[PDB]
Write a protein that binds this DNA or RNA. Sequence first.
DNA 1: TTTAACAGTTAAGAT
DNA 2: AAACTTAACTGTTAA
Length: 103
Amino acid sequence: MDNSVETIELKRGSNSVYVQYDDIMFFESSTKSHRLIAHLDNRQIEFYGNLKELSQLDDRFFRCHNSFVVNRHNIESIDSKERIVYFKNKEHCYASVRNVKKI
DNA sequence: TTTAACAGTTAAGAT
DNA sequence: AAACTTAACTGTTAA
Ligand SMILES: [Mg+2]
Ligand SMILES: [Mg+2]
């Protein structure tokens, strides 16, 4: 078990992958029902979970949109006009009108 | 500056 | 592991 760095267990059936919090740029809802996609530095992991629970895990995980939970540690910049959040790995996600200012 | 109506869309709670 | 339901979202628009 990785005890020295905060980690989240992402499950796939009886398989588990432990991912360090700051490996994660953001989570988004999957096109697949009841699944989410964790966007890591250079990998994506699809798993069963809910965005609400993830946002409750840690102050750094913020619900910036109904469909997205961002890791504040990995935000590089925000285009506030278009409400696009940019991450250190060059990915982006969207923030909602009601949540963008609270990031 | 603020809140929210509107109407379409979606996250998440039996088999 | 992977259909049906509806509260609560969404951006636009207005006040
Ligand atoms: Mg890292
Ligand atoms: Mg949080």
